[PDB]
A paper describes a structure:
DNA methyltransferase 3A (DNMT3A) plays a critical role in establishing and maintaining DNA methylation patterns in vertebrates. There are two main isoforms of DNMT3A: DNMT3A1 is the full-length form of the protein, while DNMT3A2 utilises an alternative promoter and as such lacks the divergent N-terminal region of the full-length. DNMT3A1-specific recruitment to Polycomb regions has been mapped to its divergent N-terminal domain, proposed to interact directly with the H2AK119ub Polycomb mark. Beyond the C-terminal catalytic domain, DNMT3A contains chromatin recognition PWWP (Pro-Trp-Trp-Pro) and ADD (ATRX-DNMT3-DNMT3L) domains which help to target DNMT3A to non-transcribed intergenic regions marked by H3 Lysine 36 dimethylation (H3K36me2) and H3K4me0, respectively.
The map was at sufficient resolution to allow us to build a discontinuous model of coiled structure of DNMT3A1 corresponding to residues 166–171 and 177–194, corresponding to the proposed UDR region of DNMT3A1 with a buried surface interface of 2095 Å2. On the nucleosome surface, continuous non-nucleosomal density snakes from the acidic patch region of the nucleosome between histone H2A and H2B to become sandwiched in a depression between H3 and H2A prior to interaction with ubiquitin tethered over the C-terminal tail of H2A. Arg-187 projects into this recess, forming stabilising interactions with Asn-89 and H3 C-terminus. Multiple predicted backbone-backbone contacts are supplemented by DNMT3A1 Phe-190 making hydrophobic contacts with H3′ Leu-109, and H3 Leu-126, and Arg-129.
Numbering used by the authors:
A (entry chain F): 23 to 101
B (entry chain B): 22 to 101
C (entry chain G), D (entry chain C): 10 to 118
E (entry chain K): 166 to 171, 177 to 194
F (entry chain H), G (entry chain D): 31 to 124
H (entry chain A): 38 to 134
I (entry chain E): 39 to 135
The structure:
Amino acid sequence: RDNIQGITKPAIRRLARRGGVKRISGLIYEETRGVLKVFLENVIRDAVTYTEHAKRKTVTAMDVVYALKRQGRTLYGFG
Amino acid sequence: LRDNIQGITKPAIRRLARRGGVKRISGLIYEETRGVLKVFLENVIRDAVTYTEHAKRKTVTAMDVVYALKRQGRTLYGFG
Amino acid sequence: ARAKAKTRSSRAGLQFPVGRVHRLLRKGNYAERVGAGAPVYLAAVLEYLTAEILELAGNAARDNKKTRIIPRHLQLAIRNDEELNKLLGKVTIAQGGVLPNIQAVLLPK
Amino acid sequence: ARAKAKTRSSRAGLQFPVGRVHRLLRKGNYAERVGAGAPVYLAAVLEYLTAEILELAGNAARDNKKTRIIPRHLQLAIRNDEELNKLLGKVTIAQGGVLPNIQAVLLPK
Amino acid sequence: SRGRLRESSLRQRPMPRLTFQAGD
Amino acid sequence: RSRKESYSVYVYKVLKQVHPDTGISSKAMGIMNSFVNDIFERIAGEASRLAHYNKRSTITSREIQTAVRLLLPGELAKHAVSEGTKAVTKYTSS
Amino acid sequence: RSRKESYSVYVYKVLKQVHPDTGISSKAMGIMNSFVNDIFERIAGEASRLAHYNKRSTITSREIQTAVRLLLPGELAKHAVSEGTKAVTKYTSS
Amino acid sequence: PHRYRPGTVALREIRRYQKSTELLIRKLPFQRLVREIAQDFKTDLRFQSSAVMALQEASEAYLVGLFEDTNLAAIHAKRVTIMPKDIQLARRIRGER
Amino acid sequence: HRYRPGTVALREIRRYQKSTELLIRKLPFQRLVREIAQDFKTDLRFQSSAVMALQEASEAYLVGLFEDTNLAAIHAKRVTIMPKDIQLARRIRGERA
DNA sequence: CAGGATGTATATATCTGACACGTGCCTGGAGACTAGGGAGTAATCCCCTTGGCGGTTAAAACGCGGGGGACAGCGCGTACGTGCGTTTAAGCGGTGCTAGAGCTGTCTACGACCAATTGAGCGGCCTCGGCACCGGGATTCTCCA
DNA sequence: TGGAGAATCCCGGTGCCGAGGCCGCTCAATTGGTCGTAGACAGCTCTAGCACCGCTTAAACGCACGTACGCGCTGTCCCCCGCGTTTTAACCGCCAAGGGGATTACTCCCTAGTCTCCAGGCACGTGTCAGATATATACATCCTG
């Protein structure tokens, strides 16, 4: 438990740097990891229900790809 | 037909802004909205005309417009 | 001789047509074959969703002292509901208007 | 005796598998029947789009002084071109990175 | 209590929509 | 003469069994028809893609169950699943 | 044992006829395979919907042409339609 | 003489038009605009009245949504009046450009 | 020697936009994905490619969100990204409504 | 504008493992034939689309007076960037156990197909009351003295 | 903190046209059987996931200084708003022509289906060269004096 802290401050900082951000306010990090948790829940719910339909117990990368595609964020590179 | 975009008058844009909750409007918003509406209408009517050409008829029906709107993520209820 | 017909809608206790949904599933080119229980489930889901939306719309119409539901009432019912709005986020309802909302900053103080 | 087999892809002058595309259209449950000319058209369109993407990616790779196309080159080619970027606006390419841009406001005086 | 004249067939507490409030 | 199908009869029956003293306008009946068709298409398309993904060739209640869980958000799906399962069980009971 | 199909050979042939001296990685080939599959699914679904709308039960070249015009933007649509028409004419001339 | 302080009858206009469902663009100029735009793609086209009606409903719904978005963009910048830069920012963030 | 504030940020932007690797540590992201999934089904197993795909999608989404947020922050005559800008970008994109 | 410190692009040499090719083979694609119904073409019906005219008047354009606010500037102070030193746990490797994903083989209950039957729902056609509108009175709200 | 007036809200009478219910009937769903096979289940396998342990060290964590950015206050002036007037053309109602959507018949030709034949592409092995990495540069960039 308590593993959203694993998305640490420098990680979000360099993600913002890739995004093109010059400087970052200190309140950004908590908001960003909350948004990341929301997105992860949204995707993983569909992925796991895809696995439930197939009577499987391993969440394959194809399930994640299908969930992302049905969410409008199709992913190229894994199937 | 010509210069019919001016038929989208300043009061009409003002009323559309009022419905959107806008309290104060700058003077260039009218021309900006003219351009945006022209782009949107061009995009929708292109697909509507494509559908009506594939169906081999000269009359653009309501269903052609509904299908054109639906495929762009702007699903419309009421006509089909 | 044979027994009197009992519609599959009557058999399942639903109002929506099981047979029509079955035909639309089969003729809609969705799969090579369609299970017998698929139309019943689909009809039940459609009936539930229509019941939900019509109940909310009837409440909204009663709030307006009107005894008929009009697209404005459907728009109010759909947007006032978080989950229904999430379902129909991209759907535009003709003659629906908008939800009355003024940003708190704009209001006088 | 039967004549020498000539692939339908060879007849159309394409490099893509007209036969495989015909099978995929026929077995994918898209319509009751699939016309003879549909696989040829679809294969031609797919080959054309692939040729465009590969040409732009190869140009990008040559700009990077590299012989092998890597996903970064595909991302650069797709996003730099105005038509492909619109065709693949909602597509994420793994290991593709982002285009190097910086808002002009943030650059130093 | 929301229901249908065939109960709890409808969710008895629909969630209210929230809207974004920019600024202060 | 041609015939045009619609869900007007069923939508009105549901309305009269959920609001017995309320009517509905034709311009709202059309919107309800469009909504029914849209949701039907969404669920059927998701079921078809689920069948294709698993290399099945039949659309059963399980496919529609998973499509409902995927499409409808939260308690809406939680209640639609119960309604569908109860209807299917009653149908099989006969 | 089972085999899996992909567009690797055809993508490589197209690349070699476009850039003779340029190779392509495994991840890049996977991305190109995904792109080909995605475009195939888009065009095929649009053609299926077009056939359904007009009550036709067949997917012909004109359905594919109209689909290509609907998805592909502008100059891409024009050139793709030209290539498809040329290929169809060459095929039917055999 | 009696004059309403600026802003108040602007607020009353908001409440008047968020309550109604009527169209806000005059029908004939919009129909002429639609026909003029459609003349580019095919000549001698004919429009069903329902087609023009649906085009108008969709267009004004899109414009109303865009105006809500640009109002939010303007308010985020600590100003009340909406400017074309706000519309451009809204379109860019929406992914339309 | 002491770089004035801002130059190191610019060179970091030029570095992380040029490179293409993943930016979140692998193991904590694996653990986060696993603990989020256990709220739906217990004792779930994950293919390594599934976790990799989740990380790729998450980083792409966060980078796009940060682009939109920087645009919003610059629009407000600021250069410091703030949570208000994240909220505005999320709402205009349609992820909050 | 010049010099010191320092990221940084460059060239050479080195390692290595990913790939572009070759081989064997099998299964899916091609050739040849027949059957059948999907649709392409012709003909007809009449629906609804386009064009026009005249009168009302609601709305758009125009202009004027003034005030609320958009923008620039100044000043202050917090807070975020930059660099240094100190944890820490991620990453890499190596191994071992085994869970279950995938494949194979039977076999049966399930869905498609067909023929006879009839009633559910569509089309048309009333009829009346929900409501849209107008007229008039009561209440509320905003503005200025 | 009070009146003026402007807008809104509310109540009552009236007309109408849109919703609701009724009456054929037809064609589409129901019932009763049959048959082929797609899916359910038992069984076996061996791939890939999970778990553990030790080391390196890259990366995160904590801290101090100060400086550049955020935020508040002030002034202005010019742009936008609210209101009166007038000129415009949308809107409604009615008439008329006919272009073309929609439907019916018919046939033929294009597609499905089947059988047979074979080579294109898939899986497995593999050896080399493109690319990653280490290091010494000369070079461009930032900053302060």
